[PDB]
Amino acid sequence: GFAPDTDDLKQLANGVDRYISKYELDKAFSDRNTLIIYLDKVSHSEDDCLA
Amino acid sequence: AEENIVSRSEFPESWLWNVEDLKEPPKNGISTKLMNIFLKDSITTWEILAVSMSDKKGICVADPFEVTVMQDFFIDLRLPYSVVRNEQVEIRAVLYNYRQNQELKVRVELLHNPAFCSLATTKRRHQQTVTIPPKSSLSVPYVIVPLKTGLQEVEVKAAVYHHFISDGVRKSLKVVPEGIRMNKTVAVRTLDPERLGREGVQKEDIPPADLSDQVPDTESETRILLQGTPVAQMTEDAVDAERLKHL
Amino acid sequence: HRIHWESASLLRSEETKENEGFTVTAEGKGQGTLSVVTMYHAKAKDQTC
Amino acid sequence: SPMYSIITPNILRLESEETMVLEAHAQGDVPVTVTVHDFPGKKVLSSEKTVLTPATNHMGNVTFTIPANREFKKGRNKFVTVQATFGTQVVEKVVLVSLQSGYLFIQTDKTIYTPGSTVLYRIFTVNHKLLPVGRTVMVNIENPEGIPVKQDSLSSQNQLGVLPLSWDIPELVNMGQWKIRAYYENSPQQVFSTEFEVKEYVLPSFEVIVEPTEKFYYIYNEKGLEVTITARFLYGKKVEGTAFVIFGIQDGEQRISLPESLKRIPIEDGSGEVVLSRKVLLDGVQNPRAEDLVGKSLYVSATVILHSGSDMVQAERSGIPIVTSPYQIHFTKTPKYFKPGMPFDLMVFVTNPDGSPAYRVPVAVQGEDTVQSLTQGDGVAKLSINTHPSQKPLSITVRTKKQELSEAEQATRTMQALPYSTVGNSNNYLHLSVLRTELRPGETLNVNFLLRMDRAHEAKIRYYTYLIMNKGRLLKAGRQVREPGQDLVVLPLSITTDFIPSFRLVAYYTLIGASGQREVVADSVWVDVKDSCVGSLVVKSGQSEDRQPVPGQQMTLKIEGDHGARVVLVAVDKGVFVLNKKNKLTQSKIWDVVEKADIGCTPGSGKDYAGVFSDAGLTFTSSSGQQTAQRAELQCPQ
Numbered sequence: 001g002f003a004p005d006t007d008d009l010k011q012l013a014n015g016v017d018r019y020i021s022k023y024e025l026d027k028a029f030s031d032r033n034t035l036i037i038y039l040d041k042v043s044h045s046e047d048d049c050l051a
Numbered sequence: 052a053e054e055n056i057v058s059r060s061e062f063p064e065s066w067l068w069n070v071e072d073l074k075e076p077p078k079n080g081i082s083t084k085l086m087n088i089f090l091k092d093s094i095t096t097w098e099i100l101a102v103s104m105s106d107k108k109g110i111c112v113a114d115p116f117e118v119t120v121m122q123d124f125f126i127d128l129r130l131p132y133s134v135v136r137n138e139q140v141e142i143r144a145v146l147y148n149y150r151q152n153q154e155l156k157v158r159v160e161l162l163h164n165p166a167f168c169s170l171a172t173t174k175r176r177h178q179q180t181v182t183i184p185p186k187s188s189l190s191v192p193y194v195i196v197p198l199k200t201g202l203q204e205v206e207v208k209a210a211v212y213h214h215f216i217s218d219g220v221r222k223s224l225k226v227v228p229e230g231i232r233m234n235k236t237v238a239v240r241t242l243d244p245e246r247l248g249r250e251g252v253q254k255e256d257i258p259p260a261d262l263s264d265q266v267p268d269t270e271s272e273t274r275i276l277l278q279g280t281p282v283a284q285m286t287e288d289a290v291d292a293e294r295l296k297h298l
Numbered sequence: 299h300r301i302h303w304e305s306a307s308l309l310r311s312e313e314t315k316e317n318e319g320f321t322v323t324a325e326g327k328g329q330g331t332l333s334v335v336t337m338y339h340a341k342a343k344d345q346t347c
Numbered sequence: 348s349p350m351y352s353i354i355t356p357n358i359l360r361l362e363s364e365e366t367m368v369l370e371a372h373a374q375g376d377v378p379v380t381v382t383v384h385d386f387p388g389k390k391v392l393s394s395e396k397t398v399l400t401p402a403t404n405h406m407g408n409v410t411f412t413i414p415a416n417r418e419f420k421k422g423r424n425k426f427v428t429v430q431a432t433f434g435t436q437v438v439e440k441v442v443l444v445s446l447q448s449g450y451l452f453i454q455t456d457k458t459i460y461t462p463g464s465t466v467l468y469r470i471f472t473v474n475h476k477l478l479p480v481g482r483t484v485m486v487n488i489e490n491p492e493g494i495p496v497k498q499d500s501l502s503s504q505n506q507l508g509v510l511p512l513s514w515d516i517p518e519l520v521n522m523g524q525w526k527i528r529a530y531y532e533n534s535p536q537q538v539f540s541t542e543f544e545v546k547e548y549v550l551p552s553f554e555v556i557v558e559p560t561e562k563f564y565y566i567y568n569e570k571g572l573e574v575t576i577t578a579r580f581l582y583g584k585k586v587e588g589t590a591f592v593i594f595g596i597q598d599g600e601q602r603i604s605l606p607e608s609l610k611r612i613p614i615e616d617g618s619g620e621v622v623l624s625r626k627v628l629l630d631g632v633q634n635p636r637a638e639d640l641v642g643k644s645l646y647v648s649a650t651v652i653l654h655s656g657s658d659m660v661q662a663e664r665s666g667i668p669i670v671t672s673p674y675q676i677h678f679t680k681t682p683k684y685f686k687p688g689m690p691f692d693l694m695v696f697v698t699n700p701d702g703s704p705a706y707r708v709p710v711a712v713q714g715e716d717t718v719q720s721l722t723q724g725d726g727v728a729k730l731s732i733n734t735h736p737s738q739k740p741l742s743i744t745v746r747t748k749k750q751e752l753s754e755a756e757q758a759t760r761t762m763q764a765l766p767y768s769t770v771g772n773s774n775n776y777l778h779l780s781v782l783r784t785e786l787r788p789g790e791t792l793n794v795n796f797l798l799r800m801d802r803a804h805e806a807k808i809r810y811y812t813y814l815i816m817n818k819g820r821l822l823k824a825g826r827q828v829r830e831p832g833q834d835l836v837v838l839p840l841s842i843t844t845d846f847i848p849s850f851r852l853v854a855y856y857t858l859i860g861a862s863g864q865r866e867v868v869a870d871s872v873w874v875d876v877k878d879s880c881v882g883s884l885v886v887k888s889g890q891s892e893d894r895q896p897v898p899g900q901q902m903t904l905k906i907e908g909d910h911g912a913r914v915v916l917v918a919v920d921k922g923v924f925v926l927n928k929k930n931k932l933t934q935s936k937i938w939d940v941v942e943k944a945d946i947g948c949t950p951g952s953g954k955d956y957a958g959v960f961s962d963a964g965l966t967f968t969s970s971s972g973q974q975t976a977q978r979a980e981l982q983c984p985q
């Protein structure tokens with residue numbers, strides 16, 4: 001019964017180091033069971049937090 | 052719902068390992084053979100190969116015959132090779148649809164395993180209904196806790212509303228005891244009579260293994276390996292014949 | 299078991315479930331090798347992430 | 348004076364059929380007795396008798412079968428003395444016997460296994476005619492370390508060549524490349540191998556292939572290298588997902604990766620379009636010159652993740668060559684000796700630099716002009732060059748005159764050719780040149796017998812005797828008269844199914860060299876046939892292709908084959924081919940095994956007639972004292 005928001009994913013795709021597929025965008029609240037995120041780099045010095 | 056409907060269980064990686072004899076009278080050197088075989092429950096492509104051993108012509112392998120097996124709506128349950136006891140694990144139940152123009156609203160369930168700890172219980176069972184637009188793929192994540200070591204069973208069944216189309220998949224996975232599989236060499240010995248023995252006959256004692264930090268409720272495996280060491284020696288090829296060309 | 303030169307260099311494996319002392323008798327003429335290894339699970343469970 | 352000679356294969360195998368040829372140059376009914384007795388010493392194996400026929404010009408269509416002996420056994424290898432006597436004179440020669448009594452084709456149901464399953468395998472025991480035979484076999488199963496874990500010994504008596512065995516994989520076992528080594532009981536050095544994986548895996552749900560638009564790579568590309576992604580399900584459908592692509596360089600026993608060329612692409616409906624730029628490749632290494640990359644190949648590693656994040660398919664197209672010229676020339680099937688005066692045809696094999704044959708590509712010569720050809724499906728072109736009649740060696744290279752391309756992209760390679768040592772400076776040669784076409788069973792090949800003698804004694808060559816050597820045996824023999832005034836004759840040979848994969852057509856005839864003295868002029872030419880089955884085994888469906896098969900349904904398979912043949916079936920998923928497509932049984936593998944075990948490696952036309960027959964794999968001996976050399980190994984040097 002849960003699904004991630006669309007505008008947040010749009011903002012993430014707008015920003016660097018974050019990529020969400022276009023096919024995920026036109027995948028509205030009816031079906032968003034699983035999500036996929038790709039990170040360009042992972043920071044080892046500190047913790048990279050995304051919400 | 053999922054009680055009078057059978058599932059798919061036979062998923063071998065190689066079958067039809069059979070032999071056949073061509074005994075029909077020849078028709079310009081070609082014999083026709085009509086044989087009934089049953090394709091496996093797996094939904095994939097089968098590379099059927101044939102090798103003929105004739106007593107007059109010779110051996111011959113046929114160009115690989117590819118058989119494509121298809122369904123307009125099915126389920127694939129993807130599992131790792133092995134799991135570890137008393138841990139949280141997540142598995143993928145993909146639903147594939149290849150009907151070009153039809154919206155699907157399907158009910159999916161998995162039967163409980165007494166050797167597994169999921170939300171599935173003898174009374175409280177999974178009851179979820181999902182929606183698939185035509186020509187797309189889905190994915191259901193499932194949470195499980197392995198309890199006892201062994202080859203266990205995973206059941207999944209799916210039924211589409213307003214159509215007489217159903218599917219089921221049974222898969223087998225290994226459950227491994229927690230910890231690192233290690234191999235503590237108990238003993239290595241050289242066996243040699245009349246050198247370390249007492250007048251031919253010998254007797255050597257192997258103490259029990261330490262096993263101080265063994266995980267309880269597990270069974271171990273003691274392998275005794277025997278081997279013969281070649282003592283190949285001298286007396287190789289003698290003098291060459293070149294020196295004998297004068298006698 | 300019998301070890302012959304022609305049939306040597308073969309993995310003769312004897313499997314045991316119980317941890318107990320063993321007694322081997324090496325007779326005849328020649329040499330040989332023997333290895334006893336217990337494969338098991340140990341409670342050295344560290345963090346795996 | 349009556350003249351006699353022996354024709355025998357260079358190597359004969361135990362428990363088989365061998366054929367020798369006798370010729371009389373002595374009309375009249377004369378019997379011949381051939382005796383095979385072991386060597387060294389004089390201990391008898393076999394003896395045969397046959398009377399010649401004057402009306403047939405005395406061909407030797409005489410055969411023998413070597414006994415299935417048991418005391419032949421360690422130490423150095425063994426020879427056999429073969430003797431012939433046509434009543435009044437004795438001729439004997441030494442021949443080599445082979446422990447390679449046949450071939451063992453070990454075929455497993457899969458390529459990769461799990462701990463806790465069963466390896467199923469079939470040993471196909473054939474002989475050098477690729478025919479079922481009954482022998483005893485010793486089988487070993489070796490662990491990845493190299494020590495057997497199981498051994499067995501079976502017999503193939505009245506089993507029609509199929510030896511089905513099985514093995515159980517323990518649940519507590521070592522992972523890696525497991526081996527099966529089977530050899531005939533009589534031949535401990537005839538080890539046949541089959542390596543299969545043992546791994547902890549799970550079936551992939553789709554096959555991904557990474558294919559280049561241009562299958563090679565060029566240094567001076569101003570656009571880059573384009574590779575496309577075809578990720579299709581194993582049942583032939585289209586995917587929707589993402590992929591990660593990285594590159595590298597295949598140096599000597601190492602792999603260098605380029606994290607800069609680590610790209611991510613959306614697989615849009617089973618399709619991708621990845622472009623590797625030249626700047627990234629240049630920055631990957633620290634070489635000031637790009638030309639130093641010639642001689643090394645790239646590899647593309649792709650990994651496609653579905654939108655469900657379920658499967659994990661890592662596919663690699665290793666070996667993308669970087670070459671200045673996209674065409675490479677070979678001299679594999681071309682002889683290393685040239686014929687002065689006689690036109691010396693060259694078998695030109697021009698291919699993509701990774702072995703795949705080219706097509707519609709010509710060949711050019713530095714000095715010769717207006718001469719060009721075209722490449723057929725197999726990948727062989729043709730040319731004709733007249734040679735210097737003197738003893739000057741010929742060294743030539745093959746150039747390409749392909750259009751829409753630069754003149755600096757034409758490959759070259761110096762080839763060394765040696766003159767033939769004609770006995771007595773007679774300038775008499777032989778050329779069994781054949782027109783290069785697609786040879787199929789049931790067709791007719793117009794084999795040409797090119798001739799170049801002198802008018803002084805050209806009319807004294809009454810007939811030509813031709814011999815066919817296939818799989819190291821005298822397949823057939825024949826004669827063709829040569830009346831005076833003819834310089835070319837055509838033999839419309841009906842090529843049957845017994846000429847696969849190839850046949851050495853050697854020809855011989857007698858001669859007198861300038862004073863009452865016996866000589867033999869002979870030559871052979873390599874001829875290859877399109878590699879289809881000797882028999883006709885095909886598999887299909889007895890239905891009418893109405894609709895797709897459905898899981899759990901039956902289909903009535905149709906198998907077409909010979910009569911009296913034993914056909915074995917294996918149905919295996921293509922997911923194992925996804926995980927490991929290595930070591931698969933194919934008819935091309937069988938023919939390559941035969942060719943590697945064939946008695947000939949050089950095309951022919953050696954330094955002398957003895958060298959000619961050594962290349963052709965023959966032993967000729969006569970009362971005049973002429974004899975050839977001998978060879979003791981099994982495979983050709985280098």
Ligand SMILES: *[C@@H]1O[C@H](CO)[C@@H](O)[C@H](O)[C@H]1NC(C)=O
Pocket residue numbers: 232233234236335
């Ligand atoms: C024990 O297993 C490890 C692999 O986990 C291997 O490297 C090692 O050689 C093995 N030792 C013995 C004695 O079997």
